């Protein structure tokens, strides 16, 4: 199984978690199971608390979700927790969490800054103390979403801006996309006006519908493909284009949203966060979405929304560069 | 005795500033080895240092009979440096206020806009703007000799046949703008909105990261208003007859009052809160199936 654990700088208060990766289903969130191990000494009168914090570091530290559980003085135990109880011994106090739905996923902006989750344990008589960093643990966990099994409808757009005002129609091969998979678009154009097109601008953007105090819609292009195709009046032109977003050319760009980082290691582009129909839109967190434009300058354009996510992993994401250093 | 107080306060200003400016600039590029905030503090320190570089000449001038035994050409250069450094300091305080507004309220777009190249280009733009303001006001400078009182009479009456007497208001009025409309209004509105903005966000934590906004603006206004009000008083003197040699003796004080905040900036913006010279790794364990 190889359960994960972290020890505090002090020689006590080790915390065991089965996995630092919690699948964020659309309607429910996986519980944060695990146990905390503490010696019989050093806890003669003090009480142990475990706190889960959902923060929005941008350096202050804006708080989103705060949960606290009391372990020693006092719900069924999961299978993983039962095995940890048997192995560690009697002096192990299990703790469980229940993350509410519609919370923002673990995601950071490339320069850290972003949304990070931390599990912290406490040793104090109550919650009104200024504990030191030495007698605590700061373990970062993740809350990520994965591509759904059912594919979505094929995106389609249409614009008729200036006989026939420059008919434009675009479509995608499929709605779902994986990181690194090429994206194919259609630029089927039936021009009829006297004006002719000069350049076809096809780009993939990464919307950051992110709110901390005011709603914002920052635009960050991720991929470009300049086309040198021109058309004549009353002529038909239609050919496919290929795009593949990746981080190699986007390193210089600032403010790009990247997947949650446990350490200073690099991650890929932030996966698109899909929500439920309706619901609130003031979620204090990073919201990533992708779509591709097909702009024809003479300037007509179309928008084709799509989702760029990951398939369901088999065992676990490594959360690090597997061939590190 | 009237000039005595101006001279002693001006001397105290030099003692408070020249060591202070040197202390600041010696560690602007050494604190964290760089940052945009320390960059602007560095450039403001430069503005203050060259502002006080020609200050000994001015304080020698004002104290003794307002006579100028430094030729006739040095009036132009001294006025140019003094005015340029004064405007540079004012504008840099304004841009520091704007930076505080950006970094305190909705600090979300700052991360993708706080680039070093942006700081360099805005510094170049502000330097050239200050230079182009200083140019016409300093180029038109001369000196009149009235009984050993070789004051640096710029062109206050009848410069050239091409020029007229229409400048006497406007050259001050736009001046009054650069000293009142831009700094005072913007600083006041930004400081007030930041003050009651943090109240509803609860980010205000008292002590450090606060209690500094109040002092920086009151001193600035009380120091910089007297100069502009004296300019407006001279504009009033231009009409409605002359109101006698009374007054016009606190100006060495008022500019000396200005001198005061020139030695106040190095002591409070950077000498507060932060000061330097003044976690096991995650492992893994076995688990029985």
């Amino acid at each position, epitope marked *: 199984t190889r359960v994960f*654990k972290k*020890a*505090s700088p*002090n*020689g*006590k*208060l*080790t915390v065991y978690l089965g996995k630092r990766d919690f699948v964020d289903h659309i309607d429910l969130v996986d519980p944060v199971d695990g146990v905390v*191990l*503490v*010696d*019989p*000494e*050093y806890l003669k009168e003090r009480r142990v608390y475990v706190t889960l914090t959902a923060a929005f570091r941008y350096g202050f530290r804006k708080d989103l979700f705060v949960a606290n559980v009391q372990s020693f003085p006092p719900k069924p135990l999961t299978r993983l927790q039962e095995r940890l109880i048997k*192995k560690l*011994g009697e002096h192990a106090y299990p703790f469980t969490f229940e993350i509410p739905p519609n919370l923002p996923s673990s995601v950071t902006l490339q320069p850290a800054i972003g949304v990070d989750y931390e599990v912290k344990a406490f040793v104090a008589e109550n919650l009104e103390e200024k504990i030191h960093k030495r007698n605590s643990v700061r373990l970062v966990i993740e809350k990520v979403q994965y591509a759904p099994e059912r594919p979505g409808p094929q995106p389609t757009a249409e614009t008729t801006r200036q006989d026939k005002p420059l008919h434009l129609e675009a479509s995608l091969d499929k709605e779902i996309y994986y990181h690194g998979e090429p994206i194919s678009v259609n630029v089927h154009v039936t021009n009829n006006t006297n004006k002719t097109v000069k350049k076809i601008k096809i780009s993939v953007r990464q919307y950051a519908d992110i709110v901390l105090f005011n709603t914002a819609q920052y635009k960050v292009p991720v991929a470009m493909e300049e086309a040198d195709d021109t058309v004549a009046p009353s002529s038909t032109f239609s050919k496919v284009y290929t795009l593949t977003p990746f981080l190699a050319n986007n390193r210089e760009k600032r403010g790009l949203a990247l997947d949650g980082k446990l350490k200073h290691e690099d991650t890929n582009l932030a996966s698109s966060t899909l929500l439920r129909e309706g619901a609130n839109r003031e979620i204090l967190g990073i919201i990533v979405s992708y779509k591709v434009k097909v702009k024809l300058v003479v300037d007509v354009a179309v928008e084709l929304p799509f989702t760029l996510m990951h398939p369901k992993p088999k065992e676990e994401p490594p959360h690090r560069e597997v061939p590190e250093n | 005795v009237v000039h005595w107080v101006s001279l002693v306060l001006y001397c105290l200003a030099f003692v408070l500033g020249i060591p202070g400016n040197a202390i600041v600039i010696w560690f602007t590029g050494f604190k964290w080895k760089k940052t945009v905030t320390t960059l602007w503090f560095l450039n403001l320190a430069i503005a203050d240092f060259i502002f006080l570089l020609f200050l000994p000449l001015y304080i020698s001038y004002v104290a003794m009979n307002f006579h100028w035994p430094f030729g006739i050409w040095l009036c132009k250069a001294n006025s140019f440096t003094a005015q340029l450094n004064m405007f540079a300091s004012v504008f840099f305080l304004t841009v520091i206020s704007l930076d505080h507004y950006i970094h305190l309220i909705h600090p979300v777009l700052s991360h993708r806009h706080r680039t070093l190249k942006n700081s360099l280009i805005v510094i170049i733009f502000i330097w050239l703007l200050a230079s182009l303001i200083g140019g016409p006001a300093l180029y038109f400078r001369d000196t009149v000799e009235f009984n050993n009182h070789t004051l640096c009479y710029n062109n206050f009456q009848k410069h050239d046949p091409d020029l007229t007497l229409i400048r006497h208001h406007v050259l001050t009025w736009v001046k009054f703008i650069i000293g009142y409309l831009f700094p005072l209004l913007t600083m006041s509105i930004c400081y007030l909105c930041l003050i009651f903005k943090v109240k509803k966000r609860s980010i205000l934590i008292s002590s450090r990261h606060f209690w500094t906004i109040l002092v920086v603006v009151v001193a600035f206004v009380v120091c910089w208003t007297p100069y502009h009000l004296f300019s407006i008083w001279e504009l009033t003197i231009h009409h409605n007859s002359y109101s006698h040699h009374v007054m016009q003796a606190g100006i060495p004080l008022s500019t000396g009052l200005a001198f005061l905040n020139s030695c106040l900036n190095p002591i409070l913006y950077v000498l507060i809160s932060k000061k330097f010279q003044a976690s*096991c790794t995650t*492992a893994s*364990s*076995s688990l*029985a199936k």
Partner: nanobody, 111 residues
Framework: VQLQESGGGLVQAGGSLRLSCVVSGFFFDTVTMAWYRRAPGKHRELVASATAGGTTTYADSVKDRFTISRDNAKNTVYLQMNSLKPEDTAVYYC????????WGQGTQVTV
């Protein structure tokens, strides 16, 4: 953090061992550090408690069998072995009871 320990060897039955456990880079203080054994083909279990004061708790299978003492002067943990049963053979590790130290290589004993 080095966690270098010695005192394992061939013992027929009922022989004294007097294993040692010295820690360099980490200070004992009030931290409680225990002893762990790993049977061949099995996992690691607890042996003793060895807290700062004298309150020694041992496993159910090892009662009135192992004597453990720790002295802070030389920063070393001492453990005693008497009346060796033939099921007591295992690799003996030694670190904090909270398991806050790196798992160094442990001594191997046979009965």
């Amino acid at each position: 953090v080095q966690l270098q320990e010695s005192g394992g060897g061939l013992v027929q039955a009922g022989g004294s061992l007097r294993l040692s456990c010295v820690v360099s880079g980490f200070f004992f203080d009030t931290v409680t550090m225990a002893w762990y054994r790993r049977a061949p083909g099995k996992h690691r279990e607890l042996v003793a408690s060895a807290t700062a004061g004298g309150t020694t708790t041992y496993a159910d299978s090892v009662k009135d069998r192992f004597t453990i003492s720790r002295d802070n002067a030389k920063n070393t943990v001492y453990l005693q072995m008497n009346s060796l049963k033939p099921e007591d053979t295992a690799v003996y590790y030694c670190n904090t009871f909270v398991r806050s130290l790196s798992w160094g290589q442990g001594t191997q004993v046979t009965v």
